Design a protein around this nucleic acid. Sequence first.
RNA 1: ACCUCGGAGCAGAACCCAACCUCCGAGCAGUACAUGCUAAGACUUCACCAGUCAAAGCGAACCUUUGAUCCA
RNA 2: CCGAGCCUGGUGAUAGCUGGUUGUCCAAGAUGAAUCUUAGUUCAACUUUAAAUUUGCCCACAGAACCCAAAUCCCCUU
Lengths: 287, 127, 110, 109, 52, 95
Amino acid sequence: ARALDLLRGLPRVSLANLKPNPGSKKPERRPRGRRRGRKCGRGHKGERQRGTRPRLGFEGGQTPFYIRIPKYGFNEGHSFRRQYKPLSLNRLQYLIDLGRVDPSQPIDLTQLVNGRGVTIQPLKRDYGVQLVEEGADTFTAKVNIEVQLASELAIAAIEKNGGVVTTAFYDPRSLDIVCKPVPFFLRGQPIPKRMLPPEELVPYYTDAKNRGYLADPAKFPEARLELARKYGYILPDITKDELFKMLCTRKDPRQIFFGLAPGWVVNMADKKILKPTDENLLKYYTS
Amino acid sequence: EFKSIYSLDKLYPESQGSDTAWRVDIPLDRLTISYCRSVNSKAEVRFHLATAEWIAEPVRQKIAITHKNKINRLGELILTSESSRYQFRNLADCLQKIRDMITEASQKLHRIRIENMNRERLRQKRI
Amino acid sequence: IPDPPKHEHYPTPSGWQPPRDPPPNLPYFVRRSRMHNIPVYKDITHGNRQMTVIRKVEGDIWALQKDVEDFLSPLLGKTPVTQVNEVTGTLRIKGYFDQELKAWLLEKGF
Amino acid sequence: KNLGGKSSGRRQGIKKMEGHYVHAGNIIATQRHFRWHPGAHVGVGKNKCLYALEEGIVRYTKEVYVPHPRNTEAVDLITRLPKGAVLYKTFVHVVPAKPEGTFKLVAML
Amino acid sequence: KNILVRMVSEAGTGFCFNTKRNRLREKLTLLHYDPVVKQRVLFVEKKKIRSL
Amino acid sequence: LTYFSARKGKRKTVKAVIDRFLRLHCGLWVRRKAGYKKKLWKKTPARKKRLREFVFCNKTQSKLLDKMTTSFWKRRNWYVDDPYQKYHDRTNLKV
RNA sequence: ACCUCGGAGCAGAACCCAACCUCCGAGCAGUACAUGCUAAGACUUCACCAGUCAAAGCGAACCUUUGAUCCA
RNA sequence: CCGAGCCUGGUGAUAGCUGGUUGUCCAAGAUGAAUCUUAGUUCAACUUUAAAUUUGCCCACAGAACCCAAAUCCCCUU
Ligand SMILES: [Mg+2]
Ligand SMILES: [Mg+2]
Ligand SMILES: [Mg+2]
Ligand SMILES: [Mg+2]
Ligand SMILES: [Mg+2]
Ligand SMILES: [Mg+2]
Ligand SMILES: [Mg+2]
Ligand SMILES: [Mg+2]
Ligand SMILES: [Mg+2]
Ligand SMILES: [Mg+2]
Ligand SMILES: [Mg+2]
């Protein structure tokens, strides 16, 4: 570059040559001199020069605007509402295309987070990911994806491309562990059980039309055929697909990770998995 | 593989085979579907009504009568949906319209009525 | 960040396209972002000043500015107003042209 | 001993002078009593405010006033006029600007 | 004076609406449109809400 | 309000605002009209319809509410079936 | 004595204009019980709060002033 | 120095009240509503800065009420 040649010509760069980028350092304004002194920009007498003007929102005694408006339950229970980060099929296809999400293996929340396709904040009442139909008309990826919510159209697109989608619930603790497993493994605790959905969410995850992970698998072919009929595509028989085993793999309802069972301890330091053998512990972790 | 008391096999013992979850009327091959990215897109479904063997003959006749306004000069019924940004939903609407037309075939106008009545009242001259 | 997998056909269903090989012989080069996307970004200030920034430019940023002005004047009808940050190697154009500039840079093969 | 009388003005009067372009529903003039009468494509509210019923140009004209016969007091007032006399009033009209629609080619069946 | 009273639908619906009737006047029975039923039905005065 | 709390040193939220106003993420504040539940028997149907409406706030009112609430209340919330999901963003807005 | 709201003059002709200013009036009634629901576009008491008008549409039919929030 | 002692502490009490508020230089910059409120404050108006894009002021003709003047409003041009 010509800039480096200019450097070669110029004096040595040292700590005596350094200057901040112009425009990055505003001058400091302080109350000395004619223009900034005297009353120092505070006005003349009154509470505003004395520095004691009333609180924010006080209107001089008139009933404040923010108090004369009636209370309404706009934000009632806001902190207990479940939140689901949207994952559009556009974003999913983008991730698959750039190789940040491998469709050759089951796609769950862990894989999405590892590919950085979605950011989950369990502390902010994120209960997982919801599939979003946006980008359905251009989705051309065969994928086995596990999500928490799924729109009918998103399910239709996933299935038309020959893939499988299942809606799986996660309690806040299991969700935290799934999103960031490595910190959990460093906590040194046995992998906990995945709790069941709350009573209100039970019907959703037991319904086959949602591909609920607790729904009767006998009803899945009927629902898939119904979607294929409704949206005018021929349902591909995934059993014939050479990735049928992958498309079928589903973690157990009480399982957080695909190949790890509740109660196991992951010793990452020496690449081992300690498994309890006590009958009571095994019964607990299987229940 | 791990299995808990809530495993699917235990929950629904009747359906336990893996193939049970994946074991599979308008002919989509017979229909001709086109998409126009016209904001909502548009999906057009057109099919030759007369040669629609998948539709009964009386149903074809009743459709050709009731919906003659949607039939091209080539005798092909054309119908479109433009009510969604998703061509999936547009095509779904078109297919549902086809189904509704078949079902109904199986089983402002006030001023027009008045003016036609007046035409018939004026209809008095006989060669 | 993984290198994007080789695809048989481009553009990819999401629309992504790798930079052509060999690189174009233009006086300037626009390096892709670490995500392997074109570094063209919308920007907004004051709630009404809409700008588009071509950020990772190497070489003759002034040649790039001339090319951008030529490409955009017919769209606007007037020569677009721009700022060439020769230091940071960026080009800032008044108005939103992110999609058009992305398509144009793809055509040029960056 | 004189109380009250501190009521503020009602800010009434013409909101759209002649020639002003007016969209449907715009209030043209608010009056306490009928200073201006509704003309063509101009409606009247409960409170005798004039609003545009179509999108167009506001015009003010003077026209002969023939009240609704059910308006008994006005009819009597007319009954007391001499033969040549004709009452007049100021009327507000909206001259509609655009046509109410056009026929477009949709499909070349 | 007048009193605000709660006319309750005689159609069995939980629908009620408030009317104004003179205190000295007899209890009110009135035809009114019931949204749930979607039909005009009788409403009977149940209780006095307030005195106005 | 409290600009620096005595226990955390943080800025506090005026919960009276949270009990009354909905913030749309784009920067708009929605509210109910005052008196919408008061003495409806003496209000005309048009007035009742006007009062039953959800209404936006001024620029200065919105700025005041923004000052009186903290950044937690000004985040994207992806609720399941939020009735205001569509209203959380602006479209076709020129300046 | 007054404190809120409204009408007239001051303030003659878009709007707006004070007072211990000159006068007057009101804290509702009558009516019906679509005097319903929705909704373009507007007005606005110089802020906000509040207050007005309203096409189209749906539904029956074929109206002319007082006060917030919280709390119950 | 007692209509309620003195000292220390809370305490840097509080003060819508008075006083004070320190380099140079340039630039823009002036007269309603509510309020235990009129010695204050909040909103407006004005004002300053930065930004966007496109009309802004002046403005003739035409136009703006019956009852019972000076002027004003409105806007093609310029
Ligand atoms: Mg000075
Ligand atoms: Mg001083
Ligand atoms: Mg002061
Ligand atoms: Mg930025
Ligand atoms: Mg007066
Ligand atoms: Mg106003
Ligand atoms: Mg002593
Ligand atoms: Mg002090
Ligand atoms: Mg100067
Ligand atoms: Mg008070
Ligand atoms: Mg004071």
